[model samples]
Target: ESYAIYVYKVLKQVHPDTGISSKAMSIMNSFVNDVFERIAGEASRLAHYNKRSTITSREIQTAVRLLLPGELAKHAVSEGTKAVTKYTSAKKAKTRSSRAGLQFPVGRVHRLLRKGNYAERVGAGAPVYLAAVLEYLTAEILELAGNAARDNKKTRIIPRHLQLAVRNDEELNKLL
Candidate 1:
């Protein structure tokens, strides 16, 4: 439901002073979500069928082609490529999800794990896996919080927005 709140906040700007109902929000939610699910689902199929663990921008482009009509596909391809190129250029300037921005030392994870006094000499893959999981969670939190910040018209996320970010997520809210 974190994504739901994110959508609701964004839509509030679209309909200032208008009555918003739960049913409408839900319908709108599914409408927006299905497109994403379709694209990602097809892209995953493309990757898995090709025996690739990693799905790249190429798979997404091909999925777009397979999913969209001819003219729309061509236009989407051009726009997507252009946007990707722009993103690549921006990587050196100020990257968000690049390895540069997302940093957590595997060495730290190793040390932290070792300090727990519960490991019988940690496996090499453990730190990498844990680090990857940390990055994933951190990235998700940043995204949700960032969306909240934008909705609240703040320059940066405060505790309230961050709280909403966590509280709105049913899955994460359980563990968190």
Candidate 2:
């Protein structure tokens, strides 16, 4: 997996003699490459089911819901909805078998369909702004995750990475 290779590269930077020999590197890289393809395929399915042509911010959001359990999906959709509302006047229009993001899904399923290819003109009250806000948040969170992963010697870091990293207390220090 290229992602694992990237992970190993990051880890190697901090501790070069990671005992991950060249042979292990080859195996890890191959395995990760395969995983990368599998994950991409899964993401593509998620995007397709969500009526997305290719992976974008919204699709990633959708994929995140697909990967998460029901409770986490609920929280993501809720937060995503609020995030959309904060920057725009869009309301939660409909619910799908899985969920909807901060923006309205295309078609009459939500209500009187706003017809257009462009998302901005497709709806009223700040669809463009809503899309932009969602994109920005996605990028910000991804960057935060990348940094935490690189620093904490892990491939995955969750919300706790943010919470504990920002806090200062005796209990926190003890945990560290």
Candidate 3:
């Protein structure tokens, strides 16, 4: 089935459990459109910056931050970094009993909201809900990566499968 059609159908049908209301539908619709606009805006900026026909990671990394709702962008990098560090520490542990075995610390979430100098970008208005944005972005990127890897019969999350910056269209780009 067409992806658009599938999405439309899902949107039209309220969740049996949640009993989505008209208000929810309106919000979801706006949210989807906003997301699309954010992505398109970023892509357009990157294309302009690179003097190219498409988006590149370097341009995207620079430009895409604007696409985030002011609040969402503020915490994205920090939250994402924390999540990755947690995952890495978890993986390197010699045993399940290691400190790394503990769940990711969500309390660090508030650090992103402080007015004083925090490492991540801060906005003028109330701090952005960057953790949620980062979560979505991370999931979107990883899903695309996983699909590509599976197509190539690769079993591991090789660095090359991810694009820290778009190096070339021909090569799979990974980060340091």
Candidate 4:
């Protein structure tokens, strides 16, 4: 219903104060969603064909050209290219900003693991894997702590909130 309102508003922007029936709105919504789904499937197929795991603007452009006809294809490709450029630039900026913070020492993580009674010294790639593990765990814990704070109607996250968040989940509790 929330998404339907956005679609309704967009339609109203052009038509201006027209009464659209619920059935008509539903049909349009379904049609729009189906078109997007088909386009996504085609894009994925194109990516697979090129032996690439990631889909990009080029794949989407080809897919749109294949699926849409004439002027519609040209317009869709142009819009898609513009959006892809914006998305990629924003994503690159976000990655740089997010990675600017202090990170766990991968060397220390590797050394500590080797210090364990039953553990042996691992290869150079072990530090990379350890860093990924630490990053994953930290992100999960922080997200859960935030959720715990929100649920308790608190503005700040505390140690108890982190404890509670970790305590409730089976996998997390085992880690604790």
Candidate 5:
């Protein structure tokens, strides 16, 4: 009756003999939609942060890495990048569309990597990768803070939540 039904059919095919109730399928479908909606919102925020009107593949990549951590992020990024490459290659545009990639300042990234030394030269794609990493780190911290707020049943995110979120993460704790 709904889009959920199609999802249920796909799930059934994946899990052959396993049967899922309609109610369960509906809930699962809702969860799927919710996750997509949140990721889309995050991607939009990334585009806005870069002062761009359209979201690019790099934004989506960062968003996925931010939303899904560890191995899941790697898997998602590989698949997503392939799809993005195909779409952009098919368009074959020579205008602003091609320039709609990551907008992070390459010079800033190089400076940060050099730590004010300004003596060493940075690679061409170093800045773009660094920007993606920085974005992923920021998004992960924000997500953890949000989780902390939800765990405490609080609507507002406070410093305590931020602290708690990083307290358990080894790298983040070291950074703090």
Candidate 6:
């Protein structure tokens, strides 16, 4: 949990039936630490060479690309953009979802809201509310589910573990 857990969450979320074993978990987590250090090495070095006052998004992008030359530039660039959008989008949603954030495009939000209510045109507040509220629930659920995962000596979230949290929590139990 020291590093971000979303990557593990995603692996399990994508393949729910197959659970991870302890050996597999260690290797995968080790892989994460390994991969991250490689990125940091280049990212930090690039910034140092530039004598940058503070590392910017460009540094992270170019850094990764240079380190991962096989797929470095494109992946590094796109990965940085994606990661930035993810953070920026969260902030935009935190403030208001009227603009910005390519990760979760405003168009996707509007389309979903539009489809649900055909005849009714949407107001600006609708997407803003949806963006903000969904994130609120996401963190609360993940926090509870994370506790459940840790209790099992597990590092990833499974659907049933998610179910376990939903059932255990009084607030969520009512909703589910």
Q: What is the lDDT of residue 36 in candidate 6?
A: 45
Model 2 poorest 10 in a row by lDDT:
104-113
Per-residue lDDT tens digits of candidate 4, residues 113-149?
3453212223433333333323334445456655676
Residues 125-172 of candidate 3 have per-residue lDDT tens digits of 111222223234433334444444556676433345444212332321
lDDT of 4: 0.47
> What lDDT score belongs to each candidate, Candidate 1 first?
0.49, 0.38, 0.36, 0.47, 0.48, 0.46
RMSD in Å for candidate 2, one decimal? 14.4
- Candidate 6 vs. truth: CA RMSD? 16.9
Deviation of model 3 at 97, angstroms:
32
- lDDT for each residue of candidate 1 in 1-114, tens digit (9 for 90 to 100): 123554444434433333324554454345334544455566567767777665456656677678755554565566555444544455464423232222434455445545
TM-scores vs. true structure, each candidate: 0.43, 0.33, 0.32, 0.46, 0.46, 0.46
Per-residue lDDT, model 6, residue 66, is: 60
Give the lowest summed-lDDT range of ten residues in model 1: 95-104
True-vs-predicted CA distance for residue 20, candidate 1, Å: 30
Question: Model 3 Cα displacement at 48 (Å)?
Answer: 1.6
How many steric clashes between backbone atoms does each model show?
A: 0, 4, 2, 0, 0, 1
After superposition, which runs of candidate 6 have C-alpha atoms over 4 Å from their true positions? 1-7, 92-176
lDDT of 6 at 127: 38
Error of 4 at 142 (Å): 44
What order do candidates take by lDDT, descending?
Answer: 1, 5, 4, 6, 2, 3
Tell me the lDDT of model 2 at 107.
22
lDDT leader: 1
lDDT tens readout by residue for model 5, 1-176:
13354343443333333344445445444544454444555666676787765444565567667776565467556544543343345445443212214322334544453453322333333334434333334445546655676687765445676677778876556533
> Candidate 3's error at 14, in angstroms?
17
